Amino acid sequence: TSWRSEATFQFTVERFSRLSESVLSPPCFVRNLPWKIMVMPRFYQKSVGFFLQCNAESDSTSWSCHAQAVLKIINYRDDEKSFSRRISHLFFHKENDWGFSNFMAWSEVTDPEKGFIDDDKVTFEVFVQADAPHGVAW
């Protein structure tokens, strides 16, 4: 159920080579809160910005949720070559997302010979393990 303490979800960004603004995935519910993948072009040299967002649309300023997660960019040719980084963060209204502005080089992810991009699509994945939130379901 949505109360699950962990989950793995993916989001495929299309027309990736042409990305110019931040894109958000639909929500995946964990601990009954909406978690989303956020991707955007950055420049450390261009790089892929990859963040995990939590409960960002809520007007509440009383909530908080500590979570650990594995942010991964899927390599469709070989799963063992997927690029991953781990995070640990206390999510709350003032810091509702966390990740890396320079997750990996843009030139690498968009290289047709590396295996991360196909038909200009790149798939992002997040495995999140969150603790029970505070200031939500009193």
Binding site: S22, M38, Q53, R85, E95, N96, W98, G99, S101
Partner: peptide
């Protein structure tokens, strides 16, 4: 290299 918010 280092994590942060998207801000």
């Amino acid at each position: 290299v280092s994590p942060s918010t998207s801000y």
